[PDB]
């Protein structure tokens, strides 16, 4: 798997992540696509960055992990960018997605940040 | 899968006794990084988007270069092999321009045609063609995959052939029409898709690795010696005592040849090398390979473009 993927994420962990982006869409606030996602991180608006593992070319997102660490923002890997797009409410893929305001997936996201804390 | 640049040449020996002095000149891998660049060529993998001209302009500003030129222009949407000569090597693009190219194209049919019809009709474009007016040669066409209206194929052509035009004419021959939806140049003369083919990101990142970290490795590999740009030309190798004369505008007389390729005919474009395989100059042959070999006097090559600096080799005359 790609070099920009810096740890292994268990099915369950990455499954919660899609639920988070799911629920944050219709009750909270998200941004979708690597450009909006990267603006969100550099403006310090992003709570959790979700990055898809199947991005080709890597360079599209390879800058996101180092960026997030600089800014001290949690990020996680979901397996597929097709389903990451579907979860953000679009019929097209999404290489990356930021959750800006958690909404009802408020606790769900506190947890996800915990599990990734360890994975580092 | 064969272009005329691929033909193998025989080396004929004129002076078996000729040796080279290792204190003179700089073979490609004995060059300080700064000199490597001055006489370097980039095998760039152009990205889709920018024109070839813009791409080169970025390279100049980002590497802080005075001069640079590309070989065969690639269209904005096309990717692949774009050779970029730097600095004092810039004029070698003139050696690259006449040489043949190879592409991988994606053709889209405007109607349905059987896979066997397609393959058979494309087969017929091998050989000469003429496009809108002039004549151009197609060395080979290979259909890799057909997926309904999408036809993926490789093509080898003479310099000048427009792939758009060609795909259009194939569309007419099939009747339903066709357009090119994707193009990538995979070879341009001595430049090919190999480990030397470097993208812009890799290129500018390697530059910083060297300029801002003291790491020289990665950027050195990014630059090829200008000699690379001449791998496909017939060569004549000269004795050390003629090298300085020739960088000084002297024509190359027969007594200074140590070794040459066979096949050279008068008028031919030839690369003049030293016995260390540094490139001295480009020239036009005044003699055939056999004439240069049997004679003991006369001008064998008119020297026209001099690349090597005058002080690499001593003034032995």
């Amino acid at each position: 798997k790609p070099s920009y993927v810096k740890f292994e994420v268990p099915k369950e962990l990455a499954e919660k992540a899609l639920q988070a982006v799911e629920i944050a869409r219709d009750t909270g606030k998200i941004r979708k696509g690597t450009n909006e996602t990267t603006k969100a991180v550099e403006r310090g608006q992003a709570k959790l960055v979700i990055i898809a593992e199947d991005v080709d070319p890597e360079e599209i997102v390879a800058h996101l992990p180092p960026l997030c660490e600089e800014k001290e923002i949690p990020y996680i890997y979901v397996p597929s960018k097709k389903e990451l797009g579907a979860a953000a409410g679009i019929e097209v893929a999404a290489a990356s997605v930021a959750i800006i305001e958690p909404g009802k997936a408020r606790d769900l996201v506190e947890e996800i940040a915990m599990k990734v804390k360890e994975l580092m | 899968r064969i272009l005329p640049a691929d033909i193998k040449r025989e080396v004929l020996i004129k002076d078996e006794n000729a040796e080279t002095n290792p204190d003179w000149g700089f073979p490609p891998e004995k060059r300080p990084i700064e000199m490597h660049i001055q006489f370097g060529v980039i095998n760039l993998d152009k990205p889709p988007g920018p024109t070839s001209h813009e791409v080169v302009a970025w390279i100049k500003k980002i590497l802080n270069l005075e001069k640079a030129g590309h070989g065969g222009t690639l269209d904005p949407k096309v990717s692949g092999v774009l050779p970029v000569a730097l600095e004092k090597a810039t004029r070698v693009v003139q050696a690259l321009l006449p040489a043949g190219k190879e592409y991988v194209a994606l053709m889209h049919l405007h109607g349905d045609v059987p896979e066997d019809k397609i393959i058979q009709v494309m087969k017929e474009f091998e050989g000469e063609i003429i496009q809108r007016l002039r004549t151009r040669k197609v060395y080979y066409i290979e259909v890799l995959e057909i997926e309904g209206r999408d036809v993926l194929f490789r093509v080898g052509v003479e310099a000048g052939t427009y792939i758009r035009s060609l795909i259009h004419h194939i569309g007419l021959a099939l009747g339903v029409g066709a357009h090119m939806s994707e193009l990538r140049r995979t070879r341009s003369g001595p430049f090919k898709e190999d480990e030397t083919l470097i993208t812009l990101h890799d290129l500018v990142d390697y530059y910083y690795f060297w300029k801002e970290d003291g790491i020289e490795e990665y950027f050195r590999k990014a630059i090829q010696p200008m000699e690379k740009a001449v791998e496909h030309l017939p060569k004549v190798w000269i004795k050390d005592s003629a090298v300085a004369a020739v960088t000084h505008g002297a024509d190359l007389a027969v007594p200074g040849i140590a070794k040459l390729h066979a096949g050279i005919k008068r008028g031919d474009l030839v690369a003049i090398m030293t016995l260390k395989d540094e490139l001295v100059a480009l020239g036009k042959a005044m003699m055939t390979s056999q004439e240069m070999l049997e004679k003991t006097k006369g001008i064998a090559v008119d020297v026209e473009k001099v690349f090597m600096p005058r002080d690499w080799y001593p003034k032995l005359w």
Partner: protein, 53 residues
């Protein structure tokens, strides 16, 4: 973009597995580059760690 290439064999294909070698294919074209290179600083950071610098 539809043109893909086997990293192992060098084969050009539209499929996600090399029909020759069986390897997974990657898109043939290089990523777009910007003269401004907004995130170069961070891509390089990633890249140093990849090349063991």
């Amino acid at each position: 973009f539809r043109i893909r290439k086997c990293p192992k064999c060098g084969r050009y294909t539209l499929k996600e597995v090399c029909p020759v070698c069986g390897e997974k294919t990657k898109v043939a074209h290089p990523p777009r580059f910007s003269p401004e290179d907004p995130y170069g600083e961070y891509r390089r950071r990633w890249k140093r760690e990849v090349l063991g610098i």
